[PDB]
Structures are given as C-alpha cells and as structure tokens.
Design a protein around this nucleic acid. Structure first.
Ligand SMILES: Nc1nc2c(ncn2[C@H]2C[C@H](O)[C@@H](COP(=O)(O)NP(=O)(O)OP(=O)(O)O)O2)c(=O)[nH]1
Ligand SMILES: [Mn+2]
Ligand SMILES: [Mn+2]
Length: 430
DNA sequence: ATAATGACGCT
DNA sequence: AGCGTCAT
C-alpha cells in the first residue's frame, strides 16, 4: 500500500563500450573502421581464439570463443587484429589504458563503479536532483535524447527502426509529469539526458562509442544496456518491468546466468523472470537460501538494492596464462621460467599502479591448475608481497606451490600444470 | 585447446 | 585461509 517500497529511490546507469577491444584497434588502425573484424590472441593454434568481434562480423555469425580459422569460414573478408605479446603471453595494456580514459570522463559526471574493463555503473541520483532545480520547470525536449529508447513504447492505437524510437520517445515525453520533482519517471528521463551528455563526451574525447542502460538499480540498467546495443541507450522504468519480465528468460538477469539460475528453472518449473512473482519470499528462501530468496523475491518486481560502490580502480591486479594439452608445464624449470615471466609483467603493472594511484599491494596469491582437474583454479596459495621485485615474487610463488609436485624426480613436475596465475592484492594507502 | 582477468560469497 | 560461483 503506502508502505510498499517500490525500488524507485535511485537513478542508476550502466555504460558499456561497444565491441571494446575492436574499437581500440580501429581507432589505432583506420583501415579496420567499419569493416568486419575481430581481436585475437595467439595466431598459432587455429589462427587464435577470438575475444572481441565487431558488429559487422557478428552479422555473419562470428562470436567470441571461436577459432579465427573457423570465423574466416563464416566471413572470408574478416580482418583480424592480434593482441600485443610480451614475455610469451598476451598483454592487455592497450585496453587497460583505453579503459582508464573512459573511466576518467565518466568520473566527471558522477561517482562510478568500475564493473569490468569496458563498463561502469553510475549513480546519478544527486546529479538528477541538481539538474531538476536548474531546470526550474521547463519541459524536456526530445532533442535532449537523440539516442534514447523507451522500453515498452510505443504502445496502443512507422515501419523502420528509428521511426519507432521517436514515436516511443514522443509518447513518453507527452506523458511526462513535469511539475513533480518526485515522480520517479521524470528522474529517469533526467538521468537519461545526463547519460546522453556523458556518452557524447566519451565519443568526443576518445572516439569510442558505447551503450548505456538507465533504470532504478544495477540489475535493470545492465539488462537495459543490452536492449539496443550498439551506440544507443535505453530507459527502463519501474512500470515497464511486468511486460519486460513476462518473457525475459531467467538466465539473462545478472547473476542468474549460471547454476543458481538453472536451479530456479528446474526446481520451480518456470522459464521467464515474471513467473517468480507467484512465490512467497519464504518459499524462495527455502529453495535457494535466505539471501537469494530475498533477492529473487524483490528482483522479479524490478526491485534491487545493491549499491553503486565508489570504486574506480581494481581491487586486485592479476596475470595468468593457460597451458592446454601437450603444452602443459611438466618440468620444474619450465614452471620457474613462466612464474618469472608472469612476475615480470606483474611488476611493471604494480610499479605503474603505485605511482598513478599511490597504493601498494601487500599480498601475493598463487593459483594453479593441474592437468586432469576440472575447475578454474585447482589450488590457491598466498605469501607476502614486500618488494616489487619480480625475481622475489617468482621465487616466493614457487616456494609455496613446490610441495605440490607429486613427481618422484626433482627435475620433472607432475601432474602437468595447465594454468599459472599470479595476483597482487590487499592494497594499502602508500 | 578460446584465453585473460576480476568481484564476491561460503565456510 | 582456501575454495566455489559468476562474470567480461
Ligand atoms: N580475454 C578475454 N577477454 C574477454 C572475454 N570476454 C570479454 N572480453 C574482453 C574483450 C571485450 O571487448 C571486452 C568487453 O567485453 P563485453 O562488454 O562483454 N563485449 P564487447 O564490449 O566486446 O561487445 P559488446 O558491444 O557486446 O559489449 O572484454 C573473455 O572471455 N576473454
Ligand atoms: Mn562492451
Ligand atoms: Mn562489458
């Protein structure tokens, strides 16, 4: 009734770059602009695995996870860009540095939560209240929202894609309660005006294009972000959630794409997000635990309370390489060498981190995977990070895993390692 | 035999 | 402390 919290207290946006690693290479090499192209790591095996696909190549069916030699079967004119290699491994420095350019522009508008290398969450609540008071009381022109989609509109009593957008935008704006600085739909509209400005600044200042989702919480803005990619932004209001969730497959919601989402489907016998509304919170707490139960119950009414954390820098700095198949490390010296290669790149990035952000990692986590195991990591161990010295980090990382060699021979290493991963963490103000 | 990372929950 | 999940 009057005491049902509708999850409309905040304005939150999710900006995510369109085919990010591809845009970075396309800005650098103009010959790849507006062409089907992909980014690839390691051209030896089947031409390398594809990690990012432009939208022109997606049109032919090229996806990430594909081998470049298979993607050229689907698209013969596919242009490839290969990631820098340093010390025998992929090096993502170019994209990290591109990512920092974008984070700094978004930071100028609001406090952001770096959520990946190519996306950040924005909490625009206060900026919305600020803009609402300098607007005095003026209506909101559709000229302020040249790339916004209003999810669920048009509705009621034009055949092309941009025609629909306008007529949906017009309908929304025609309906807008301009008088009421408290109406949550007006605030989203104003959030969306700010996000247009911020997306323009990103494109003006980096040449990168991105999509954005604007809703009342992180989960809805993330889902909204995907609805009109690329180069568009989508407003999802509280009232569009019922129709939106009635055919929304469960797995498309953040944190439900895995086994939890699969057990919601199998146990509860449903397919779509909107179907969860029939269960009581207690029922959902019984099947999925108190925390998930409560979260599911509020979520399927479009209510979510996870806050935008004020974090623009990563909490961990990490460095890993896989060794699949016959290339799995099988001798002690081979393990030592790569641990040193990984420690060396970690050292350049730590030293850069300490001068740019004046903090220092204090703990070093070593994780490995053995051949024949099944999980991502097979063993995690940890020691102290006192000096930014690769040889010490290499030595210490080896020390705390060497007892895992079931090899009777000192020279050999079994079982063969298929993943080495080093991660500096527990950062303190420096 | 896509890889390379990063955040966070559970016990 | 060390493992498990979910993610881009
Ligand atoms: N190495 C590696 N990189 C990945 C992986 N997944 C993503 N990346 C890297 C490369 C990706 O470019 C970058 C951004 O990831 P997204 O936002 O999920 N997809 P993008 O921005 O490319 O397309 P869209 O327009 O659909 O958002 O993360 C992966 O599994 N492995
Ligand atoms: Mn992206
Ligand atoms: Mn992303």
């Amino acid at each position: 009734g009057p005491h049902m919290a509708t999850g409309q207290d905040r304005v939150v946006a999710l900006v995510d770059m369109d085919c990010f690693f591809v845009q970075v290479e396309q800005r650098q090499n103009p010959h790849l602009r507006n062409k089907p192209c992909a980014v690839v790591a390691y051209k030896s095996w089947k031409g390398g695995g594809i990690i990012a696909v432009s939208y022109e190549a997606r049109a032919f069916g090229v996806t990430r996870s594909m081998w470049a030699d298979d993607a050229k079967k689907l698209c013969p004119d596919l242009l490839l860009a290969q990631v820098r290699e340093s010390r025998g491994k992929a090096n993502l420095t170019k994209y990290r540095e591109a990512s920092v350019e974008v984070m700094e522009i978004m930071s100028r508008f609001a406090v952001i939560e770096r959520a990946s290398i190519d996306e950040a969450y924005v909490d625009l609540t206060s900026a919305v209240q600020e803009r609402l008071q300098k607007l005095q009381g003026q209506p909101i022109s559709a000229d302020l929202l040249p790339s916004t989609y209003i999810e669920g509109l048009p509705q009621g009593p034009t055949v092309q894609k941009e025609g629909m957008r306008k007529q949906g935008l017009f309908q929304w704006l025609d309906s807008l309660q301009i008088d009421n600085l408290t109406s949550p739909d007006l605030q989203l509209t104003v959030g969306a005006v700010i996000v247009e400005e911020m997306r323009a600044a990103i494109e003006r200042e980096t040449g990168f294009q991105c999509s954005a989702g604007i809703s009342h919480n992180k989960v809805l803005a993330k889902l909204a972000c995907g609805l009109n990619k690329p180069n568009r932004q989508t407003l999802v209001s509280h009232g569009s959630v019922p129709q939106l969730f009635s055919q929304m497959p469960i797995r498309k919601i953040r944190s439900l794409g895995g086994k939890l989402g699969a057990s919601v489907i199998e146990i509860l016998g449903i397919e779509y997000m909107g179907e969860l509304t029939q269960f009581t919170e207690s029922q959902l707490q019984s099947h999925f635990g108190e925390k998930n139960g409560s979260w599911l119950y509020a979520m399927c009414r479009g209510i979510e309370h996870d806050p935008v954390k004020p974090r623009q820098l990563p909490k961990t700095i990490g460095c890993s390489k896989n060794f699949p198949g016959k290339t799995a490390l099988a001798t002690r010296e081979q393990v030592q060498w790569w641990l040193l290669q990984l420690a060396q790149e970690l050292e350049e990035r730590l030293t850069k981190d300490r001068n740019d952000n004046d903090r220092v990692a204090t703990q070093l986590v070593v994780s490995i995977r053995v051949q024949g195991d099944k999980r991502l990591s097979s063993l995690r161990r940890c020691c102290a990070l006192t000096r930014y010295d690769a040889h010490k980090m290499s030595h210490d990382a080896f020390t705390v895993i060497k007892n895992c060699n079931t090899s009777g021979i000192q020279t050999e290493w079994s079982p063969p390692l298929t993943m080495l991963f080093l991660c500096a963490t527990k950062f303190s103000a420096s």
